[PDB]
Design a protein around this ligand. Structure first.
Ligand code: HEM
Ligand SMILES: [C-]#N
Length: 184
């Protein structure tokens, strides 16, 4: 089960958020973690193209060297709250798993700067609610969360100390492909 009470930013600025640039996950909190331990890396690039909000996702496993991409067309529920119907693709846009009814995730932008953000995301993969996920994003992969995001984490009734840092997972990102999957 997920949470749908996550509160979107008051005066959230979408022209800055959706600029087609890359956001890196530097810290996160999984409320329903897998039974098998896993080092995780992820980044995304939210932007627009052809007239729609697009979001490109990236996951990497430094251990297995695994990598997978996704691209979705976003639909605005309210500013700050979005629903994404994703499709798994190769780094060049070739579709591995088409868009599907049961497949989608919804995220809420709880806080956002020109350099940082705090989001809540809920993944549904075929009618199954896959659980609550809170992520701390930064436009720079090597920066520690600032006082503003951390105040936002606290304002959400969470503890940052319960967050896990990806800073030490020997991550590797593909921003070139991330930015180009935006038009795919
Ligand atoms: C930046 C926010 C994130 C978003 C929007 C997001 C969204 C998703 C999406 C769309 C998928 C499905 C991929 C597919 O099969 O096509 C997925 C799978 C997965 N994500 Fe993320 N994710 C995020 C961050 C992370 C982080 C930080 C972790 C680490 C806890 C994580 C761990 C996983 C794992 C282990 C899977 C595979 C599960 C499966 O294939 O059913 N994700 N994620
Ligand atoms: C990914 N949850």
């Amino acid at each position: 089960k997920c949470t749908k009470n996550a509160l979107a930013q008051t005066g959230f600025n979408k022209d800055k958020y959706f600029n087609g640039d890359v956001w890196y996950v530097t810290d996160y909190l999984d409320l329903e973690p897998d039974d098998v331990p896993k080092r995780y890396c992820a980044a995304l690039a939210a932007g627009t193209a052809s007239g729609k909000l697009k979001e490109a996702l990236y996951h990497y496993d430094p251990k297995t060297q695994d990598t997978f991409y996704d691209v979705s067309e976003l639909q605005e529920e309210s500013p700050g709250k979005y629903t994404a119907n994703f499709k798994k693709v190769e780094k060049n846009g070739n579709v591995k798993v088409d868009v599907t009814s049961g497949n989608y995730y919804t995220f809420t932008v709880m806080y956002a700067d020109d350099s940082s953000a705090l989001i809540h995301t809920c993944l549904h993969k075929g009618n199954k609610d896959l659980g609550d996920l809170y992520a701390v994003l930064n436009r720079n992969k090597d920066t520690n969360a600032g006082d503003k995001v951390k105040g936002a984490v606290t304002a959400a009734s969470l503890k940052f100390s319960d967050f896990i840092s990806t800073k030490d997972n020997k991550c590797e990102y593909d921003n070139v492909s991330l930015k180009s999957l935006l038009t795919k």
